[PDB]
Amino acid sequence: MKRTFQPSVLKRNRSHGFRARMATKNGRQVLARRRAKGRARLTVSK
Amino acid sequence: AVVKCKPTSPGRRHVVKVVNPELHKGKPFAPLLEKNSKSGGRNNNGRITTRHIGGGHKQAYRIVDFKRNKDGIPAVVERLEYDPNRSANIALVLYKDGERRYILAPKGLKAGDQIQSGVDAAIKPGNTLPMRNIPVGSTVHNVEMKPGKGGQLARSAGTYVQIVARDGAYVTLRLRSGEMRKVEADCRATLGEVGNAEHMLRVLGKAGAARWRGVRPTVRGTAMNPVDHPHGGGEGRNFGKHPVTPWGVQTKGKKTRSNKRTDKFIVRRRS
Amino acid sequence: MIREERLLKVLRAPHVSEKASTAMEKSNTIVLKVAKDATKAEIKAAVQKLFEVEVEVVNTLVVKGKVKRHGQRIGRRSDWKKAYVTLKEGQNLD
RNA sequence: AGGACCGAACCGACUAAUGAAAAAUUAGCGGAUGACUUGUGGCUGGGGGUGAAAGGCCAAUCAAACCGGGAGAUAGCU
RNA sequence: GCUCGCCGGAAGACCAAGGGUUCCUGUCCAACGUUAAUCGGGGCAGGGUGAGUCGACCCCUAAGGCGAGGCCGAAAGGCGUAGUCGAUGGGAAACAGGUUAAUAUUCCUGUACUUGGUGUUACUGCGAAGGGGGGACGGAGAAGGCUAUGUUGGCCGGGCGACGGUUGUCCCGGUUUAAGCGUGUAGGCUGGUUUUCCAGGCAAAUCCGGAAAAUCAAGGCUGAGGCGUGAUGACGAGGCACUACGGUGCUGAAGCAACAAAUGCCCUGCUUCCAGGAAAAGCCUCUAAGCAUCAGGUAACAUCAAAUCGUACCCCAAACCGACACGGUGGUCAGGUAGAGAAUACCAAGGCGCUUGAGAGAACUCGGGUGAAGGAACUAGGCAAAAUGGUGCCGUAACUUCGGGAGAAGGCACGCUGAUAUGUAGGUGAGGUCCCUCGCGGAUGGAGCUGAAAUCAGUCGAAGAUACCAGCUGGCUGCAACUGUUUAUUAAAAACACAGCACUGUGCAAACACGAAAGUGGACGUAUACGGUGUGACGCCUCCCGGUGCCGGAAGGUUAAUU
């Protein structure tokens, strides 16, 4: 059965990666929040 | 000519082709072509703005000349061509100076026919001249509304406009709708009827044909649930409401012209 | 023209292994560990100056670091660049 | 020629009996040059999308997704 | 190790995606592995991924994204021009053999190619953000020419049979060889060459386009395959020396022909159809500003250059998505016998026996087999099973929109052997002989090779479409015309859609829709068009305006802000 997650690296990056996040204000905010939290992996970026 | 297809399958039974042999069997004039990608009836916001558009065959855009400005140079008609972008047929013409253009093919036109734009040009089919120069009572097509703009009225397969009157700086056109309309007399117009007049006799004959013409299916409001359309819901087949668009506006009869800027030009509305 | 200083920095070590040995013996090709940033030309230059030996050609590759586990904690070894440097016929290297 | 016919791949899911499986199995079954199917990428965002329309589908979630917040909502009820 | 069994259009081989060391070697067996484990995709250590020509990067663009200014918007921000990004598409170049425990079009061996500079001598119009060409394109169909590949014969090497026969019309194996360079064929496209002029191609153009005129019927472009060379080489069945029983080193025969033949190539072709079928660069060409006897261009030749990143391994799976060593997953390769076939059966190459076994042979459950007599009596219902099942030929009703219905129904023939005919009809096609504008040419010729289908005669069996495979049929009737679509996961239908029909709106800055707006879709469309609504092929058809809507009217009554 075709399950929901069907990985594709480029797609992932474009969607969720650092640059995408940077591009918008909300993305930036998210990043900031993550930083505040103390996340080790700030984004999906490898 | 129209051709009723033999019923060798259902979905072919009710098909009627409109088969013109005089069209060019060949690749079109490639310099006048350009790309034309499909919308899916969706705007820049990405939302569907006009339902039921989608798919259909890839099509190039033939760059048709509706402005028709080669004044004084006589052109000769090379060939008639199928245009997928319109109900009419187009005609590749060749000016004496070596330029080619596509034009709407008018009714009588065929390969070898000479045509001409300009004030001086002969009042014959396919020739183009300002409506002050065109005799009253004549049938014209590809009619400009603003001088210099390009033909906007009567472009469709078997349409034409009657010049009913010329009163000073304006002329009154009897448009195909039945609307009588004032138009500046310096606006250009092509003599005769536009070509492909048996276009309306064609019958698609199956669902697939429609699809091929980029038309997705249309669901009836009454078949929906109330959350979707005003007509929706009802156990079994109900419909106890005045017909309306998907956005609640009356559909059987309610007029929607709001343009107060061009009310002056409309001599009489259609009926 | 590569700088002397740069050249010195380029070459990290000789690589000892069976394959390397074989290369040395049969094909006259030495297997070096080099700086990850070191391009082929630079490597060649280094070889020529620092080992005093004519170079035919340099093939490089990047070796990826193995992931290991020291007790409970996971940790990755570093990536590093390997270079097969083929010396010209008759060139004997100390 | 054909939204033509019989039929593998491929797409589906009418009948049947039966956790390996949070919808499968085996045996049969429908379509199979088309309104077909499929890979890659793209676009449409929550009273919003998309919908050959079943209130279907929108990350195992849908008569209004998920995450966080107002928030210790309110609970004549247990 | 020897048997046995299973897959073989896969359960084999090679990739993409995704994973990220799972690869190979040594070593260890606590845990992990549904048991044991000496084994492992487990633990620990070490090793392993080699590129000018494969892929990325790179040049070019599609959908789309971002977007200087700009337009718009309380703010945030939205849209968008110039531009700049974006492959899933276009763009230079490599093949064969050998090798590692583990890499190879990457190493080695041989033999190649490419496009850049730099320098040269030789020549002499070069030059783009511009012009033109080209690139550059659909579906279906039909062949014909080919090859991959296979079969048989020849050849070469080996064999003479654990049991009757087996020196022959006998048995086993092999019989392979690339890119490149040269040739330019089957075949496809197009008339060429020169001269003159011209409101066209944002300017110019010797280019393209258009007009004339002259003269020659062959000119050019394209093109699989073959042949030649590449190759006195490589590979080569197996023999022979050493042996850490893993292998290593030497050696090496023949290496042809015919027939059959793709869904691959010629073919981005041809024919045909309507639904009318990307873009931009590379590439070719034209000039402008310019420079002017300099640069630049093409000419060969020399030299230098091609960086960087990926390359292990899994990849229909025990390594990816499914919590698991548990269904899903795009592309490429496609041997034999039978067969229409990529179906099916048995096999090859290759890969596996599915990580608990051993007994026993109760009830009951699951999955199968057979069944006296009866044959739907079962049951809500013939549910399920049983049956039908192929090719050819004969034959086939109502009704019909004249296509259908129809594979209607129903029947007959079917193996093997011989003969017709030591193998026919056909297919292919070598020598020889003749012609010739000379070649991959044309004629004639028929050797050899291959080879159905039929008829007649015999013959075996209970049974010849013998297995696997493979329609059940007919009669009346509701609904929906039809093919389609639908509740992912209890509903596939009579529901939705549909061609068709009707009403209605909409004159273009269209109606309408998404947007505080700018704008965008509608549409680069223009009433034979577009939107909405209902109905739903085809046929025969299809009173009430009082109520509620809509349309038109505006005499009077009533009536807002305002005053």
CSV table of N, CA, C and O (backbone and C1' of nucleotides) in Angstrom, one decimal, chain E residues 126-156:
chain,number,residue,atom,x,y,z
E,126,C,P,36.3,37.2,-43.1
E,126,C,O5',36.0,38.0,-41.8
E,126,C,C5',35.5,37.5,-40.6
E,126,C,C4',36.0,38.2,-39.4
E,126,C,C3',35.0,38.6,-38.3
E,126,C,O3',35.0,37.5,-37.4
E,126,C,C1',36.2,40.5,-38.9
E,127,G,P,33.6,37.2,-36.6
E,127,G,O5',33.2,38.5,-36.0
E,127,G,C5',33.9,39.1,-34.8
E,127,G,C4',33.4,40.5,-34.5
E,127,G,C3',31.9,40.6,-34.3
E,127,G,O3',31.6,40.3,-32.9
E,127,G,C1',32.6,42.3,-35.8
E,128,A,P,30.6,39.0,-32.6
E,128,A,O5',29.6,39.7,-31.6
E,128,A,C5',29.2,41.1,-31.8
E,128,A,C4',28.0,41.5,-30.9
E,128,A,C3',27.1,40.3,-30.4
E,128,A,O3',26.5,40.8,-29.2
E,128,A,C1',25.9,41.7,-31.9
E,129,A,P,26.6,40.0,-27.8
E,129,A,O5',25.2,40.1,-27.2
E,129,A,C5',24.0,39.8,-27.9
E,129,A,C4',22.8,40.5,-27.4
E,129,A,C3',21.9,41.1,-28.4
E,129,A,O3',20.5,40.7,-28.3
E,129,A,C1',22.3,42.6,-26.6
E,130,G,P,19.9,39.6,-29.3
E,130,G,O5',19.7,40.5,-30.6
E,130,G,C5',18.8,41.7,-30.5
E,130,G,C4',18.7,42.4,-31.9
E,130,G,C3',18.3,41.6,-33.1
E,130,G,O3',16.9,41.4,-33.2
E,130,G,C1',20.3,42.8,-33.6
E,131,G,P,16.3,40.0,-33.7
E,131,G,O5',16.7,40.0,-35.2
E,131,G,C5',16.1,41.0,-36.0
E,131,G,C4',16.3,40.7,-37.5
E,131,G,C3',16.1,39.3,-37.9
E,131,G,O3',14.7,39.1,-38.1
E,131,G,C1',18.1,40.0,-38.8
E,132,G,P,14.0,37.6,-37.8
E,132,G,O5',14.7,36.7,-38.8
E,132,G,C5',14.3,36.8,-40.2
E,132,G,C4',15.2,35.9,-41.1
E,132,G,C3',15.1,34.4,-40.8
E,132,G,O3',13.9,33.8,-41.4
E,132,G,C1',17.3,35.1,-41.0
E,133,G,P,13.3,32.5,-40.7
E,133,G,O5',14.4,31.4,-40.9
E,133,G,C5',14.5,30.7,-42.1
E,133,G,C4',15.8,29.9,-42.2
E,133,G,C3',15.7,28.5,-41.4
E,133,G,O3',15.1,27.6,-42.2
E,133,G,C1',17.8,29.6,-41.0
E,134,G,P,14.3,26.4,-41.4
E,134,G,O5',15.3,25.8,-40.5
E,134,G,C5',16.3,24.8,-40.9
E,134,G,C4',17.3,24.5,-39.9
E,134,G,C3',16.8,23.7,-38.7
E,134,G,O3',16.7,22.4,-39.0
E,134,G,C1',18.1,25.6,-37.9
E,135,G,P,15.6,21.4,-38.3
E,135,G,O5',16.1,21.4,-36.8
E,135,G,C5',17.3,20.8,-36.3
E,135,G,C4',17.6,21.3,-34.9
E,135,G,C3',16.6,20.9,-33.9
E,135,G,O3',16.7,19.6,-33.4
E,135,G,C1',17.2,23.2,-33.6
E,136,A,P,15.4,18.9,-32.7
E,136,A,O5',14.2,19.6,-33.4
E,136,A,C5',13.0,18.8,-33.5
E,136,A,C4',11.9,19.7,-34.1
E,136,A,C3',12.1,20.4,-35.4
E,136,A,O3',10.9,20.5,-36.2
E,136,A,C1',11.7,22.0,-33.8
E,137,C,P,10.5,19.2,-37.1
E,137,C,O5',10.0,18.1,-36.0
E,137,C,C5',8.6,18.1,-35.5
E,137,C,C4',8.6,17.2,-34.3
E,137,C,C3',7.2,17.0,-33.6
E,137,C,O3',7.1,15.8,-33.0
E,137,C,C1',8.6,18.2,-32.1
E,138,G,P,6.0,14.7,-33.6
E,138,G,O5',4.6,15.2,-33.0
E,138,G,C5',4.3,15.1,-31.6
E,138,G,C4',2.8,14.8,-31.3
E,138,G,C3',2.4,13.4,-31.7
E,138,G,O3',2.7,12.5,-30.7
E,138,G,C1',0.8,15.0,-32.6
E,139,G,P,2.8,11.0,-31.1
E,139,G,O5',1.3,10.6,-31.4
E,139,G,C5',0.4,10.5,-30.4
E,139,G,C4',-1.0,10.1,-31.0
E,139,G,C3',-1.0,8.7,-31.7
E,139,G,O3',-1.0,7.6,-30.9
E,139,G,C1',-2.2,10.4,-33.0
E,140,A,P,-0.1,6.4,-31.3
E,140,A,O5',-0.9,5.7,-32.5
E,140,A,C5',-2.3,5.3,-32.3
E,140,A,C4',-3.0,5.1,-33.6
E,140,A,C3',-2.4,4.1,-34.5
E,140,A,O3',-2.8,2.8,-34.2
E,140,A,C1',-2.9,6.1,-35.7
E,141,G,P,-1.9,1.5,-34.6
E,141,G,O5',-1.9,1.6,-36.2
E,141,G,C5',-3.1,1.2,-36.9
E,141,G,C4',-2.9,1.4,-38.4
E,141,G,C3',-1.7,0.6,-39.0
E,141,G,O3',-2.2,-0.7,-39.3
E,141,G,C1',-1.6,2.9,-39.7
E,142,A,P,-1.2,-1.9,-39.3
E,142,A,O5',-0.5,-1.8,-40.7
E,142,A,C5',-1.3,-1.8,-41.9
E,142,A,C4',-0.4,-1.3,-43.0
E,142,A,C3',0.9,-2.0,-43.3
E,142,A,O3',0.7,-3.1,-44.2
E,142,A,C1',1.2,0.4,-43.2
E,143,A,P,0.9,-4.6,-43.7
E,143,A,O5',2.4,-4.6,-43.2
E,143,A,C5',3.5,-5.1,-44.1
E,143,A,C4',3.9,-4.1,-45.1
E,143,A,C3',5.3,-4.2,-45.6
E,143,A,O3',5.3,-5.1,-46.7
E,143,A,C1',4.8,-1.9,-45.0
E,144,G,P,6.2,-6.5,-46.5
E,144,G,O5',7.7,-6.0,-46.9
E,144,G,C5',7.9,-5.5,-48.3
E,144,G,C4',9.0,-4.5,-48.3
E,144,G,C3',10.3,-4.8,-47.7
E,144,G,O3',11.1,-5.8,-48.5
E,144,G,C1',9.8,-2.6,-47.1
E,145,G,P,12.1,-6.8,-47.8
E,145,G,O5',13.3,-5.8,-47.4
E,145,G,C5',14.0,-5.1,-48.4
E,145,G,C4',15.0,-4.2,-47.7
E,145,G,C3',16.0,-4.8,-46.7
E,145,G,O3',17.0,-5.4,-47.4
E,145,G,C1',15.1,-2.8,-45.8
E,146,C,P,17.8,-6.7,-46.8
E,146,C,O5',18.6,-6.1,-45.6
E,146,C,C5',18.4,-6.6,-44.3
E,146,C,C4',18.9,-5.5,-43.3
E,146,C,C3',19.4,-6.0,-42.0
E,146,C,O3',20.8,-6.5,-42.1
E,146,C,C1',17.9,-4.2,-41.6
E,147,U,P,21.1,-8.0,-41.7
E,147,U,O5',21.5,-7.9,-40.2
E,147,U,C5',22.6,-7.1,-39.7
E,147,U,C4',22.3,-6.4,-38.4
E,147,U,C3',22.1,-7.3,-37.2
E,147,U,O3',23.4,-7.7,-36.7
E,147,U,C1',20.4,-5.8,-37.2
E,148,A,P,23.5,-9.1,-35.9
E,148,A,O5',22.8,-8.8,-34.5
E,148,A,C5',23.4,-7.9,-33.6
E,148,A,C4',22.5,-7.7,-32.4
E,148,A,C3',22.2,-8.9,-31.6
E,148,A,O3',23.2,-9.2,-30.7
E,148,A,C1',20.2,-7.8,-32.0
E,149,U,P,24.0,-10.5,-30.7
E,149,U,O5',22.9,-11.6,-30.5
E,149,U,C5',22.0,-11.6,-29.3
E,149,U,C4',20.7,-12.4,-29.6
E,149,U,C3',20.9,-13.8,-30.0
E,149,U,O3',21.2,-14.7,-28.9
E,149,U,C1',19.2,-12.7,-31.3
E,150,G,P,22.0,-16.0,-29.2
E,150,G,O5',21.0,-16.9,-29.9
E,150,G,C5',19.9,-17.5,-29.2
E,150,G,C4',18.8,-18.1,-30.1
E,150,G,C3',19.3,-19.3,-30.9
E,150,G,O3',19.1,-20.5,-30.1
E,150,G,C1',18.3,-17.8,-32.4
E,151,U,P,20.0,-21.8,-30.3
E,151,U,O5',19.5,-22.4,-31.7
E,151,U,C5',18.2,-23.1,-31.7
E,151,U,C4',17.9,-23.5,-33.1
E,151,U,C3',18.9,-24.4,-33.9
E,151,U,O3',18.6,-25.7,-33.5
E,151,U,C1',18.3,-22.6,-35.3
E,152,U,P,19.9,-26.8,-33.4
E,152,U,O5',20.2,-27.1,-34.9
E,152,U,C5',19.3,-27.8,-35.7
E,152,U,C4',19.7,-27.6,-37.2
E,152,U,C3',21.1,-28.1,-37.6
E,152,U,O3',21.2,-29.5,-37.7
E,152,U,C1',20.6,-26.0,-38.6
E,153,G,P,22.5,-30.2,-37.4
E,153,G,O5',23.5,-29.9,-38.7
E,153,G,C5',23.2,-30.4,-40.0
E,153,G,C4',23.9,-29.6,-41.1
E,153,G,C3',25.4,-29.6,-41.1
E,153,G,O3',25.9,-30.8,-41.7
E,153,G,C1',24.7,-27.4,-41.4
E,154,G,P,27.2,-31.5,-41.1
E,154,G,O5',28.3,-30.5,-41.5
E,154,G,C5',28.9,-30.5,-42.8
E,154,G,C4',29.6,-29.2,-43.1
E,154,G,C3',31.0,-29.1,-42.4
E,154,G,O3',32.0,-29.8,-43.1
E,154,G,C1',29.8,-27.1,-42.1
E,155,C,P,33.0,-30.8,-42.3
E,155,C,O5',33.9,-29.8,-41.5
E,155,C,C5',34.8,-28.9,-42.2
E,155,C,C4',35.3,-27.8,-41.3
E,155,C,C3',36.1,-28.3,-40.1
E,155,C,O3',37.4,-28.6,-40.4
E,155,C,C1',34.5,-26.7,-39.4
E,156,C,P,38.1,-29.9,-39.8
E,156,C,O5',38.4,-29.4,-38.3
E,156,C,C5',39.2,-28.2,-38.0
E,156,C,C4',39.2,-27.8,-36.6
E,156,C,C3',39.3,-29.0,-35.6
E,156,C,O3',40.7,-29.4,-35.5
E,156,C,C1',37.5,-27.6,-34.9
